[PDB]
Design a protein around this ligand. Structure first.
Ligand SMILES: Cc1ncc(COP(=O)(O)O)c(CN[C@@H](CCC(=O)O)C(=O)O)c1O
Ligand SMILES: Cc1ncc(COP(=O)(O)O)c(CN[C@@H](CCC(=O)O)C(=O)O)c1O
Lengths: 396, 396
């Protein structure tokens, strides 16, 4: 029966990573997958995390199953991060949070939930966007439409095109938004634009779904959440999928959360029970380690202070690389202006290099980037910057 | 959008745990969830596990993503346990293993794999069986059919009712088999019966799906895989969803595996690519901590030894309670023969109690068991045995 199966293509992202491991020539440079790297080019485990892990090793007395929705404290802490310590949504108990295996996992349970318990038939995602967004919703049988986002001429947010593009999104339609650090453009709406979108959203009857994979990598923890909070004060219902993979360096421990918000405590609880049924029929209950670490850090004032410092250093090193990248491009002889790179937020920068050029950099200079022209700025170091910039100039 | 969602009923197994946790009677007895407990009534972390976590804590340099199918060694180690060191399935490179979030996760990925890449429409599940088996498969769009299995009156396997029922399984249909320690009956087929089912399986043309959640709790590692190894040596294709939750006591770390077997190496690889695609659109990549622990224990001879020793102590402590349970029931005045409980395998026992009796046990004596009358022998200790048997006799 397996002879009739047609092979699946390779992940445009995850795929690339196996080729890099395959590449034999010395000097290779990996600017693909979005993982943080320090000056030495390594993806270390944070000190705050090693601390928490030692604490768990000393005090865990059992590995007994967690509830379907995971660690209680985990949910409370994420709700504060997202909505604010004294949020009204929290005080009125309008939100429930389920611990999931990564942000991907939060997007999937949200999708299974919507497919089986609502009349939602369509989800609108931006173009471009993280490739896996479409695969996640399709797996639940939801049709996925796309709206305009990037102005490739001005390297800015094409707001007028975005608004017009969404004119055909109906009441009951789900509309996906990147909380901050849009992947892959790096362009986020301003507070004013968010507020406008918030208003248009209510008037149109959309169900907002926020994907928050980089809280803290743009301006800061509180700042990066302004868009969402402007939506939260305007909406009755909304969903948010968050990930702690990047801001805690916990990638392989799959720590994330899916937060449900309804009009009142009674409705959200009723809806949440169904979200749990969807989880039960998927993986039954969430992996404890990663979430234990995060909850331990967010709850301890000493660990928390350390972690915040580590996130700040991660954020600043990336911005520093953005500057050094643009400067070195000039010094190496690039006539194309790359100034826009400094205005982008987060790990990824939309270089604007053509698929052809990307393939040339890979097979001819040993430099890897996603075929969309997206390049990981977090992967740039003082040591590979020159070789990197020199290659790009060559393909220009 | 959420106003009309109808609440979900509690999970027949997990729901119980929440009621038990809430019950204020100081003498409560939990015999529901299938979790192990030592002579003192606690669910400890194995010593082998604790040692591995220590190694991990002091040697992990990064938390970088694992890759869709997980830790490679992990995959190789589970294939030898399932098939045997020198299996031909391994040599001919006919099997592909993907690390999944628990056995439940292994069941869902397999279900999504089948429904999205083949013609499979129906799934055959023993009657009775683990309640969540239907939820998992129905969620992937697969229809679920049940086949006779248990002889109520004789408290045995109705091999005649079984084979007559399965005569209705058309070719291409999927038939679920519990590797060993059937849930909830505890009655497994003898090798002879496995032999038969295997040959009849190839004749009727079914795709065998094995749920292996208790390797090591019936007789032993090798002994427990006998039925599977018999199917293996005879079929061209089969799927095995296994769990490390129990035999490693890693319940909340979600450690499982989904193994695909095809006719040859090119076919399994082609089919395995779609499985990875199914995974990518679910949780992206598996949780590293628990699987890492399993991998390091199984790879280190000095740790393996300790682990097998610990597994044996658990299997033996459960046999001693099964006997003690039957002896005590007579002593406290039972007007019946529960001798049929010594023939059952694993952690559970199909007591014979009715829903109403199971209910009274909870309501009046604070003794918790599954409504189907399933009881966790592994939750019985020398200390709670007496109170426990008095309650049953009283409701008898
Ligand atoms: C918008 C966005 N959403 C969700 C996720 C998923 O988060 P997890 O916690 O890993 O589930 C990522 C990670 N995207 C990175 C990492 C690799 C990948 O998963 O593609 C990237 O864009 O290369 C992301 O960029
Ligand atoms: C036949 C069977 N298959 C799969 C699983 C899934 O194992 P995980 O690795 O935990 O995903 C269990 C656990 N059944 C136990 C535990 C609680 C539950 O999952 O219902 C029980 O039936 O009490 C099981 O009995």
């Amino acid at each position: 029966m397996f002879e009739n199966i047609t092979a699946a293509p390779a992940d445009p992202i995850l795929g690339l990573a196996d080729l890099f491991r395959a590449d034999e020539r010395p000097g290779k440079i990996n600017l693909g997958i979005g993982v943080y790297k320090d000056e030495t080019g390594k993806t270390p485990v944070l000190t705050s995390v090693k601390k928490a892990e030692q604490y768990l090793l000393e005090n865990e007395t059992t590995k007994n199953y967690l509830g379907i929705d995971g660690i209680p404290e985990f949910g409370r802490c994420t709700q504060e991060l997202l909505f604010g310590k004294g949020s009204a949504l929290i005080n009125d108990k309008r939100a429930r949070t389920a611990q999931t295996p990564g942000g991907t996992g939060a997007l999937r349970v949200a999708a299974d939930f919507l497919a089986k318990n609502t009349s939602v038939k369509r989800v609108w995602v931006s173009n471009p966007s993280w490739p896996n967004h479409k695969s996640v919703f399709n797996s639940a049988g939801l049709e996925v439409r796309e709206y305009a986002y990037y102005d490739a001429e001005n390297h800015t947010l094409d707001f007028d095109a975005l608004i017009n593009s969404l004119n055909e999104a109906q009441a009951g339609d789900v509309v996906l938004f990147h909380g901050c650090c849009h992947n892959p453009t790096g362009i986020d709406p301003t507070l004013e634009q968010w507020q406008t979108l918030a208003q248009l959203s209510v008037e149109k009857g959309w169900l907002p779904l926020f994907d928050f994979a980089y809280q803290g990598f743009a301006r800061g923890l509180e700042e990066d959440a302004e868009g969402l909070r402007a939506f939260a004060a305007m909406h009755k219902e909304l969903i948010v999928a968050s990930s702690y993979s990047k801001n805690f360096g916990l990638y392989n421990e799959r720590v994330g959360a899916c937060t449900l918000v309804a009009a009142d405590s009674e409705t959200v609880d009723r809806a949440f029970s169904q979200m749990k049924a969807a989880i039960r029929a998927n993986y039954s209950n969430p992996p404890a380690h990663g979430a234990s670490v995060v909850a331990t850090i967010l709850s301890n004032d000493a660990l928390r202070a350390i972690w915040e410092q580590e996130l700040t250093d991660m954020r600043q090193r990336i911005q520093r690389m953005r500057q050094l990248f643009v400067n070195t491009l000039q010094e190496k002889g690039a006539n194309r202006d790359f100034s826009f790179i400094i205005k982008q937020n987060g790990m990824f920068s939309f270089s604007g290099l053509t698929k052809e050029q990307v393939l040339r950099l890979r097979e001819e200079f040993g430099v890897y980037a996603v075929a969309s022209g997206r390049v990981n700025v977090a992967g740039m170091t003082p040591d590979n910057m020159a070789p990197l910039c020199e290659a790009i100039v060559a393909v220009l």
